[PDB]
Amino acid sequence: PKISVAFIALGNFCRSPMAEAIFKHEVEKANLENRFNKIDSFGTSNYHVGESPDHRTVSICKQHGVKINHKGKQIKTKHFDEYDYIIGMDESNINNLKKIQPEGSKAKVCLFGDWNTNDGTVQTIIEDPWYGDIQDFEYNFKQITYFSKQFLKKEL
Ligand SMILES: [Cl-]
């Protein structure tokens, strides 16, 4: 039974759209598209609804040959029954999602870094790069790619 994954953070502008794009790219590279139904990204906030992702997230993806095309969208309560995994970037994301999640809904809310090996390659928390520089977006790329592979390796 295919699985559906939603990456959800705060603004659906920096990290979540990058995570959706990189994950799709790794799924394709691994030739496992058949195991998945939906792979999306949302934000708990409506601040960037309708907007294309941060130009720095777009640049970083393009620089790595990762396709990305998205418009900001806000989480909906039904998303907890729609997706098998609802993956946050940082702890504040989890706090908010856990407070919104209807009891008994199927979605397994978790931090992407939960798939970290803790082998020193990357840190567990995917920090919001918005107030930073392109190097923070670059490090996010590295973390998301790493957790993407770990996920495909552990969940399938
Ligand atoms: Cl959040």
Token digits of residue 66: 């990762």
Residue 114 Cα to ligand 1 midpoint, Å, equals 17
Q: H helices within 40-133, ranges in order?
A: 55-63, 79-82, 91-100
Residue 93 Cα to ligand 1 midpoint, Å, equals 4
Query: Which of 17, 8, 1, 7 has its CA nearest to residue 137?
Result: 17
Residue 44 Cα to ligand 1 midpoint, Å, equals 5
Query: Which of 16, 28, 2, 1 has its CA nearest to residue 87?
Result: 16
Resolution (A): 1.9
What's the CA gap between 153 and 130, in Å, rounded?
Answer: 30
What's the CA gap between 23 and 130, in Å, rounded?
Answer: 20
Domains and CATH numbers, the chain: 1-156 (3.40.50.2300)
What technique solved it? X-ray
Residue 96 Cα to ligand 1 midpoint, Å, equals 5
Distances (CA, A) of 22 to 1, 30, 51, 78: 22, 12, 19, 24
Residue 140 Cα to ligand 1 midpoint, Å, equals 17
